[PDB]
Every structure is written in C-alpha cells, then in structure tokens.
Design a protein around this nucleic acid. Structure first.
Ligand SMILES: [K+]
Ligand SMILES: [K+]
Ligand SMILES: [K+]
Ligand SMILES: [K+]
Ligand SMILES: [K+]
Ligand SMILES: [K+]
Ligand SMILES: [K+]
Ligand SMILES: [K+]
Ligand SMILES: [K+]
Ligand SMILES: [K+]
Ligand SMILES: [K+]
Ligand SMILES: [K+]
Ligand SMILES: [K+]
Ligand SMILES: [K+]
Ligand SMILES: [Mg+2]
Ligand SMILES: [Mg+2]
Ligand SMILES: [Mg+2]
Ligand SMILES: [Mg+2]
Ligand SMILES: [Mg+2]
Ligand SMILES: [Mg+2]
Ligand SMILES: [Mg+2]
Ligand SMILES: [Mg+2]
Ligand SMILES: [Mg+2]
Ligand SMILES: [Mg+2]
Ligand SMILES: [Mg+2]
Ligand SMILES: [Mg+2]
Ligand SMILES: [Mg+2]
Ligand SMILES: [Mg+2]
Ligand SMILES: [Mg+2]
Ligand SMILES: [Mg+2]
Ligand SMILES: [Mg+2]
Ligand SMILES: [Zn+2]
Ligand SMILES: [Zn+2]
Lengths: 194, 91, 97, 132, 25, 216, 98
RNA sequence: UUUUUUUUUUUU
RNA sequence: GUGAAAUUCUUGGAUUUAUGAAAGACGAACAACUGCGAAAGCAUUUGCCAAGGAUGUUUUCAUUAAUCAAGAACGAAAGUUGGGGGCUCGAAGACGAUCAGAUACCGUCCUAGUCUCAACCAUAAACGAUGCCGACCAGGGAUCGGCGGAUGUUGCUAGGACUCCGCCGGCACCUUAUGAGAAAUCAAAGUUUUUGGGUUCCGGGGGGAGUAUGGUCGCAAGGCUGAAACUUAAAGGAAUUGAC
C-alpha cells in the first residue's frame, strides 16, 4: 500500500544494553550495510537525519518534521522531497518548500532526512487495465471501482435521475454545504482548463 | 529470426490498450526488467525485487532507487547539490 | 601514466592477480607493490593494508574500480587487487614513492 | 559635523533611463535612504518624466533636502537600464549631475554602475526586433 | 502570392484532399 | 513624523593596513524596543576608494569593501571584505588587437580566510614590433594562466589576510606574476582585478582589535 | 545581381557565426555583419566639465570615461545615419573616415 | 520613427 | 511603457537602494575581411579519452589510385513521443492602443516551445545560388600553422617575445587583360568553332506542378520517387535612359 520502500535501521541504545530498532522511509541511494548518522552534528550526506538548523539553504530533504520531535510528517511519498529555502535565527525558524509548492515555516529544531524519497517515477507507468487498479487498491482501501453520480437514481445522489444522464445544476457546491449535499467540485474558485 | 518488427516486449499485450499506451509502457517494461551495474562488486547483476528496491545477485547488496530504474535522473542532481553544499560547509 | 606503466609491467614483468595470490605474495615477501582498486570491499582493503604494513610493502590505490583495473591489466575479468612481483621495464616502484 | 568645512559624504545613485530619472541619496553603506526624488514627481505628462528639466528640478530638490540633513559632498553612481537593455544613460543624467554640482554640493568619485552582463538572458522583441 | 504562403495553401489543400480520400476509402 | 530625528551618526574606522582610519559617517535608527542600533549597523558593507584610504590619487582605480565587525561607542570598526577594479579602469584596460588572459584561484590564508582571487593580464607589444597585433597562442595563454594560478596560490597561502592586503596595496603579486611570465610572452597591466571572501573565521574580538587602535 | 563581393558580411572560411542583438531595435544580426562602433566619451559633457571641476571635493581628480560598444543592424544603422548609401565605386572603400 | 487606402477597357 | 496613452504594479509599500540565498539559461568586452571541422557547426577554467591537417623526414609499402548507381554515417532551426527542468524570451491565446476596419505592425500577461536526456524527423537563400581529382597560367602587400637562415634587444628563463630574408600549406585581399563573358563580374566563371585530361550529378519556353496516381520511409507533421489532360507568346537574365 506504500509506493516508497522502507529501511530497517539498527541503532545502539544510548543508555541501555540492547538494540534500538527503527523503520525509516527510504531515501534514494541508500543500501544495506550503510551507516546512517542522526543528530545535530551528523554530516550532510544522503540518508542522514539532521536538524533543519544544520541543513544549509538549497538542500533537498525528506520526511520533514512539523513539530520538534513529531518524527516526520512532510514529503514522505515516493519521489517527493522538500527544499530548504532560508533560515531566521531571530525566531529560530526555517522556511521550506513542500512537494505541493507551498512555503511553510517550521521551528529550526525540526529534523529531516537528507535526499529525496526512493521509488520516484512510479506514477509515470500506465496501468492499461482494471486489474492493475484492483490490485493497487486492494492493499489500500475499498475505494475502487467508482460509480458516477449521474448513473445513480435520485434517492442516493444529487446528480441522480433524469431521462438523460446529466447533473442538471452547477457541479460547484458551497464550502458550508451540509454532508449529503456537498458533491462535485467543492468550493471551486474556478473550473475548466487553465 | 526477427519475431516482431517493432513490438518487442510489449507483444505480450496483443492488440489491446492502444499503440500509444503500449509504446509508452515499453520503456518501463524494458527498464524494470533489465540488469544494472553494481557499484559495490562491479557486476551486471542488479535486479528489481519490488518497486524501488534493487538487489544484487552476486554480492547481496540491496539499494533503494527508482520505481522502474536503478537510478532516477533527479538522484544524480540531488547528489551533486548535496556534495556542493557539504563542500561549502566543510571548507 | 599509471595505466601505461601497468601495461608495460603486464607485457614485460611478473605479477599476480587476485586477493588470494596477493596475500600469498605478501606472506612470502615476493611482492614489491600492491595495487588495490576502489571497488575492493572495505574489510578486504583493510586486511590487505595490514598485511602490507606487516610485510613493509608499498600500497597504491588505483583510480578506478575492479573492472577498470582488469581492463588496464589487459584481462577480460575483474581484478580487485594485484601484486607486482618484479617490474620488468617499468619503474612504478621507483615512481610512486 | 565637527568643523564647518568638514565634508560629510553621501552616495547619489542616478538611474537615468529613457522613461524616468531617479536621484536616490543614501549613506556610504547604501542601507539608509536620505532622499529619493524622481523625474516623474516634478512633471505632469508621462512623456516629460525623463526630461533634462525634470532631472534638474529633482536634483535641486535632492540637494536642498540633503543640505538640511547635513550632507555636503556626494559620490556619483550613474547607471542606465542595463541588463540586456540599453546601456546608454538617459537624457536626464547630465542635467541631474550639473544641477547637483551647481546647487553648492561637492562632487566626489563618479562611477558608471550600469549592470553589464558577462552574458545575458534573451532580449525582448523577437529576432526581427522592434519594427517601425 | 508569396511562394511560402502558396506552399502552405497547397499543403492545406493536400491534407483536405487526403481526408476526403480516407473518408470514402 | 520625521524619521531622521531619531537616527544617530557613527564614524567608520578602517583597519590598520590603510593609512587613513576615518572612512566616513553612517547613521541608524536609535534603539527602540527590540530594534537595536548595534544589530542594525552590524555586518554593513561599505565600498571605499583605495585613493581615499591611502590619500593617493594613483590608487583611485581600486575599490575596497569594508565590513562592520563590531560597534564600540560611536565608532564602527571594519575589516577587509574584498576588493574590485573600477568599471572605467577595466574598460580602459581592455582593448582590441591584443590578447586578454584571465585566471582565478580559491585559496585559504593562515587565519582560515577562504577567498577567491581574479587576476587579469594583457599581451604587450615590443618597442621595435612592426606587426599590428600582439596575439599569444593558446598554449602560451594556458602556460601563463598556470603560472598566474601557481603564483597566486603560493602568495595567498604563505600569508594571512593582513599581509595579503599589504601585498595588494602596492601590487606586488602582479609584479611577480609579470616577472615570472615574461619568459613566455611579454605582459602589461598585470593586476589582481578582484578578490572576494567566500568564508570567514568565527568572529574574535581580540583578532578584530589587533588591527584597530584605541579610540578614547 | 550581386552587388557586394563579401555579400554584405565578413565571413570567410567559416560555416556559421552567432548573432548579436541590435543595440537600437534588438533585431538578431550576425556579428560579422553588424555595424560595430566604439564610443569613448567623458561622463560629464564639455558644458558641465567646468561646473563639475569647480564642485570637485578633492584637491585633484580625473573625470572618468564612458565606454560603449554599439552594434547596429543594417536598417537601424542606415536610419540613424551611422552609415550612408554610397556610390558603386565609393562603397568599395574600406578605410574609416578621417 | 503617430497617421497616408484607392485610380474601369483599347489606343495614342 | 509609448509618438501620446492605456491595459498593468502600487501606503498589505510599488519603483529605487544595500547585503545574502536559490534556480535555469547565456558565455559580453578580447573577437579580427582571424582559427578548427566533411557539412551542420564549434568561443568560461582545469583533467581524461580517443581523432586530425600542415610542417620536418637521405624512415617504410610499392600503384595499393580518381570519381562514383545501389547501399550507408552525419545533418541548423522548427516539429513529434516520454522523463527531467522550466530564469529569460515567447508561436497559440487573452487584453490595451492605433485604425474606416486592425484577426497586425506598438504595449501588457502568457500556453506550447526555448535547455537536457532517450527515441524520431532529414528538411533550409543547408549559398561561394559556383561538384571532385590533376596540369599550366601576371604581379603585389598582409595574415594563420610549421620549418630553414641571419641579426640586435629583452626589469625574462639555450630558449620565449620582437626584427629581417626564404620554403610549404591555408582563410582571404588589392591591381591588371595578353583571357573569358549577354554583361554584372571572374586570377579561375581563363587555358573552348584553334571545340577532346579523368570522372559523378543534373537542365531543355512559361504554367498546370513538385500537383494526381503508384511505390517507399515516418507515430505524425511530412520526406524520397514523380506524371498527364489542358492552357499560353511570352515568362526570364544583365545592362542604358528617363520617371518616381
Ligand atoms: K469496491
Ligand atoms: K465510473
Ligand atoms: K440528474
Ligand atoms: K452527461
Ligand atoms: K515616461
Ligand atoms: K549572394
Ligand atoms: K557589415
Ligand atoms: K480594344
Ligand atoms: K518555460
Ligand atoms: K487606416
Ligand atoms: K503568446
Ligand atoms: K524534420
Ligand atoms: K549566401
Ligand atoms: K602565405
Ligand atoms: Mg453521457
Ligand atoms: Mg511613468
Ligand atoms: Mg523602417
Ligand atoms: Mg611563437
Ligand atoms: Mg537589387
Ligand atoms: Mg549556413
Ligand atoms: Mg505605420
Ligand atoms: Mg479599395
Ligand atoms: Mg541584489
Ligand atoms: Mg568571455
Ligand atoms: Mg583564435
Ligand atoms: Mg518534456
Ligand atoms: Mg515575460
Ligand atoms: Mg526543440
Ligand atoms: Mg532542397
Ligand atoms: Mg609564420
Ligand atoms: Mg519547361
Ligand atoms: Zn553486487
Ligand atoms: Zn536595429
């Protein structure tokens, strides 16, 4: 159910006689037997986990924390990454560009893995048949196949009904439209081609 | 004998899905099933185990790479950028 | 150039290719220079370096992988490391230091 | 500040384009602005914004303001549009410089700081240029 | 007529003729 | 409201390398709340003529960049932060019917100052020369560039920032480069056209104060 | 009819020459064909030289110079009168005007 | 460098 | 920003000023009647990999050569398929102007494209509108590469830079007719009714027409090959005078 491969990493526990086992989102280029260094003083190499305060501008990172210690929430999908834009030492905040293109300000103590997520280019391949989508979503959730609203009867969809197949009213709906009425293009600022 | 004029690997799909889609998927079909050079042991024995995972049959090293290729184009650019930044920090 | 010196050694001198033969030459003190490629595994490289240190023999890190080292030696197979028992007409031993 | 004859030096960036004239006075670092009068602040029609008379009026206003802030001498940084556009200063550059000289301010170093690309992005207008 | 535009017109006409050809087979 | 009524003036002080210490005056808004005049003035860069610094008009073709490292009282103490030729000087030097040679090198001083140096030179005609051009071959240009790079690297690596600027002031490095390269092709107008600071060491008040005298 | 032996340009023993952009209109024109002029003129015009010198803030100071390389296309050069139409015999003269 | 389109057939 | 304006951005700070960071293009000035390459084309430094002309040669083989149907390699720009990039500029498109109209010329914002990788496309006023090999054929000064000789300097390390005289090869230029040409012009477009050195391609008044059809290549755009019916007394080249 996840495009990106995962990496099992074994650490030595700081203060206990045992092994600390972790599961990281794999960055492209990492291999079995590689040494990973996590910390403020870790070197700037792909696969290392560093605080954003120690990552110079223009760096490509992945699995970026939103709150210090949350252990990573941003740019985790295959082939995705965030870009470090600038630092603000006055308030200790770093600016990042997310995969969607949005610019976000996070505390400079937030951690991030150097490099991009492995498995990029997955969505380029055409699937060519319904069976491939069936297999894809079987391990994700019951969200496939999808029945069009205009193919239903009125009782179960606002788009249902009619002697012809058609919506019959604007497919753009209100942001505050109640559940059951909020279908189609929700709160669309525009429609159609660019 | 030249079994197929131009279909090659996508000949398994017969006459389905359209010529454009068959040609488009030919690239992935060839790349994900081709062998790749292993930098750790110098052998052309790297094969895809699953999307993004590439294992070498000779030395046993497993790497995380592209979905259908061992190394994506952006991977080299990211490595170059990281190396430049690391050199700037270290100097 | 290192590649041309190695070709001269290949054509006119005595050499051994391979990890086992390299270790044998180091043990017997016959080898005079050990060339190790980049592709060589780190543990094997460390062991070869320790052997060369014990035997008081020079070690050179070839600017290439095992495939490149084999191509330079003129063979059709990968060479992880090699030992120069005697340079016939080359002067690698006298030039590298 | 100490002696009457002591010279306090500002920097006058004179941007002389063919559509407007800027006379911007700053400190030596350039991080502090003292006075910025443009040719378009002294005329009514858009076609006279780069006129020598407008440049002279702007320079006179700049000198009058600077004399109150205590600047006695000015370095000159004359620039054109630069980039991939024209490198020729606009008609107002010389009127501004002459007015500054005549307004009792002392003139220091004069430098052309037009941005010169070692090689630029494509210039506008297409490969056939502006056709008239 | 400029020879360039005459050639363009001829190419348009050829495309239209080929489309008419293919319509009827 | 007048914003210049709440601005204080400060005197810029050049390092001990230059003959003249008083560079000029710069102002900043007075401290109010969390806005500090000292932090406002920190790391400001001033471009000053070497002719002004040395009271010698023969050096008017050089521009020196002085950065503000610290503020004490009403004095902003600065230090060398790079140098550049002037546009008019460079345009006058560049001419047709002759060969232009340029080189650059990244070097580090004993003080851990990483800087990039850009040197320029031109081929020179002989007094009895008759042909209308003085063009050096590409191999000769490459050899001259190699000599320039070697000399610049040695000179920069064998000294600190203070002594390097001391060498820059009289243009000793260019003289040595010309002397070394004359064996390949006569050269004229050999100069260190530009110098920029890529990295600087961690700020040290003692190191800053060595080059600044007591102001009291 | 061919009216110029050089074909209006200065390409010999060469396949292609990269173009420049006209300093007036921006039209693309091969460099070997563009009309090139070099202007070296005092920054301060002779009229204002005296006033600027009187306002000089130093005991001695040499006024700088402005250097501009103008590259014109044929149309712009002719229109601006950088070059003029010459007679058949006169257009063979290559020496610059005195 | 604002704008400036058009002139029935033959013949002299 | 323009001839003048407007679309447009602007007290939520536009434009301008200083410092710094990122991204992708582009390699100015030097830069030329200069260089390299079969052509297309090729201009930041350094390293690696092969390749090449000319020069020098009292080195080697000994006719192994010239030009070329068929058949092949490369082949600007635009264009196609799919990734990566996407700063600038910018087909299409949308607005503002001008105008009798203005689907334009001018201005403003922009999609594809412009860059790179993999695979195609194979066409340009792809021009010197001028096939290749060889011989002869006037003069002159420059210039690039190599070589030979002479000579005097160098803030230099026998050499390099410059000076002078020559040879070979190359990009070109000026003068001239004893030459050619319809001339324009050409030192090769000469050595042609005093017609013959070898060899490839290719034209037969102007249109229809690079069209129809067939074949072949291409994903497509289109490329290559390529008519006829019919129509017509001119079309066209160089140069002269006038008019504009
Ligand atoms: K379902
Ligand atoms: K459906
Ligand atoms: K309905
Ligand atoms: K419908
Ligand atoms: K204006
Ligand atoms: K021609
Ligand atoms: K010309
Ligand atoms: K009639
Ligand atoms: K773009
Ligand atoms: K009209
Ligand atoms: K457009
Ligand atoms: K094509
Ligand atoms: K041509
Ligand atoms: K010659
Ligand atoms: Mg329907
Ligand atoms: Mg205006
Ligand atoms: Mg015109
Ligand atoms: Mg020489
Ligand atoms: Mg004509
Ligand atoms: Mg061409
Ligand atoms: Mg008009
Ligand atoms: Mg009409
Ligand atoms: Mg800036
Ligand atoms: Mg350049
Ligand atoms: Mg050259
Ligand atoms: Mg694409
Ligand atoms: Mg734009
Ligand atoms: Mg393209
Ligand atoms: Mg053709
Ligand atoms: Mg020579
Ligand atoms: Mg005919
Ligand atoms: Zn392996
Ligand atoms: Zn023009």
């Amino acid at each position: 159910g996840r495009g990106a491969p995962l990496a099992r990493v074994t650490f030595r526990h700081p203060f206990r006689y045992k092994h600390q086992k972790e599961l990281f989102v794999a960055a492209e280029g990492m291999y079995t037997g590689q040494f990973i260094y996590c910390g403020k003083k870790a070197n700037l190499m792909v696969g290392n986990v560093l605080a954003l305060r120690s990552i110079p501008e223009g760096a490509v990172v992945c699995n970026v924390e939103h709150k210090v210690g949350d252990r990573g929430v941003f740019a985790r999908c295959s082939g995705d990454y965030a870009i470090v834009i600038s630092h603000n030492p006055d308030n200790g905040t770093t600016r990042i560009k997310l995969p969607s293109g949005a610019k976000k300000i996070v505390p400079s103590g937030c951690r991030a893995m150097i490099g991009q997520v492995a498995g990029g280019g997955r969505t380029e391949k055409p699937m060519l048949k319904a069976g491939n989508a069936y297999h894809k979503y079987r391990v994700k959730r019951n969200c496939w196949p999808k029945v069009r609203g205009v193919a239903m009867n009125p009782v179960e969809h606002p788009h249902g009904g009619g002697n012809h197949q058609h919506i019959g009213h604007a497919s753009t709906v209100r942001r505050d439209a109640p559940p059951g009425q909020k279908v189609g293009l929700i709160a669309a600022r525009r429609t159609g081609r660019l | 004998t030249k079994r197929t004029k131009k279909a090659g690997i996508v000949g398994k799909y017969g006459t389905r899905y359209g010529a454009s889609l068959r040609k488009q998927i030919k690239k992935m079909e060839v790349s994900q099933h081709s062998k790749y050079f292993c930098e750790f042991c110098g052998k052309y024995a790297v094969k895809r185990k699953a999307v993004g995972i590439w294992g070498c049959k000779d030395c046993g090293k497993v790497k995380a790479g592209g979905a259908y290729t061992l190394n994506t184009a952006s991977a080299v650019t990211v490595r170059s950028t990281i190396r430049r930044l690391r050199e700037q920090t270290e100097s | 150039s290192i590649n041309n010196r190695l070709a001269l050694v290949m054509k006119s001198g005595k050499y051994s290719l391979g990890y086992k033969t390299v270790l044998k030459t180091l043990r017997s003190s016959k080898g005079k220079l050990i060339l190790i490629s980049n592709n060589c595994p780190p543990l094997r490289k460390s062991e070869i370096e320790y052997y060369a240190m014990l035997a008081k023999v020079g070690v050179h890190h070839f600017n290439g992988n095992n495939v490149d080292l084999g191509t330079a030696c003129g063979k059709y197979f990968r060479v992880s490391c090699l030992s120069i028992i005697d340079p016939g007409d080359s002067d690698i031993i006298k030039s590298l230091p | 500040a100490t002696r009457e004859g002591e010279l306090v030096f500002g920097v006058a960036h004179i941007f002389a384009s063919f559509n407007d004239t800027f006379i911007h006075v700053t400190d030596l670092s350039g991080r502090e602005t003292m006075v910025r009068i443009t040719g378009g602040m002294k005329v009514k029609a858009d076609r006279d914004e780069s006129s020598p008379y407008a440049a002279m009026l702007a320079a006179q206003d700049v000198s009058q303001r600077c004399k109150e802030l205590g600047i006695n001498a000015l370095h000159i940084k004359l620039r054109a549009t630069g980039g991939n556009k024209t490198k020729t200063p606009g008609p107002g550059a010389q009127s501004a410089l002459r007015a500054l000289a005549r307004s009792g301010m002392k003139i220091g170093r004069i430098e052309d700081v037009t941005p010169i690309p070692t090689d630029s992005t494509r210039r506008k207008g297409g490969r056939r240029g502006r056709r008239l | 007529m400029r020879a360039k535009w005459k050639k363009k017109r001829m190419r348009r006409l050829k495309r239209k003729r080929r489309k008419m050809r293919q319509r009827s087979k | 409201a007048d914003p210049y009524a709440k601005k204080d003036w400060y005197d810029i002080k050049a390092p001990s390398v230059f003959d003249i210490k008083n560079v000029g005056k710069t102002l900043v808004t007075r401290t109010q709340g969390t806005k500090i005049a000292s932090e406002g003035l920190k790391h400001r860069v001033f471009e000053v003529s070497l002719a002004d610094l040395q009271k010698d008009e023969d050096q008017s073709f050089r521009k020196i960049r002085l950065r503000a490292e610290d503020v004490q009282g009403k004095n902003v103490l600065t230090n060398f932060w790079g140098m550049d030729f002037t546009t008019d000087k460079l345009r006058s030097l560049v001419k047709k019917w002759q060969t232009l040679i340029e080189a650059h090198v990244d070097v580090k001083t004993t003080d851990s100052y990483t800087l990039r140096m850009f040197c320029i030179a031109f081929t020179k005609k002989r007094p009895n020369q008759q042909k209308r051009t003085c063009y050096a071959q590409s191999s000769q240009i490459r050899q001259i560039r190699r000599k320039m790079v070697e000399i610049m690297r040695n000179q920069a690596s064998s000294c600190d920032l203070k002594e390097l600027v001391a060498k820059f002031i009289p243009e000793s490095i260019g003289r040595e480069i010309e002397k070394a390269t004359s064996s390949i092709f006569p050269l004229q107008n050999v100069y260190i056209r530009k110098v920029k600071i890529l990295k600087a060491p961690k700020f040290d008040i003692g190191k800053l104060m060595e080059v600044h005298g007591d102001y009291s | 009819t061919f009216k110029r032996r050089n074909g209006g340009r200065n390409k010999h023993g060469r396949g292609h020459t990269k173009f420049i952009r006209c300093s007036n209109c921006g039209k693309c024109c091969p460099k070997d064909k563009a009309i090139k002029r070099f202007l070296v003129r005092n920054i301060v015009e002779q009229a204002a030289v005296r006033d600027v010198q009187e306002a000089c803030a130093f005991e001695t100071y040499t006024l700088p110079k402005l250097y501009l390389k103008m590259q014109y296309c044929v149309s712009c050069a002719i229109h601006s009168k950088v070059v003029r139409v010459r007679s058949v015999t006169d257009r063979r003269v290559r020496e610059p005007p005195q």
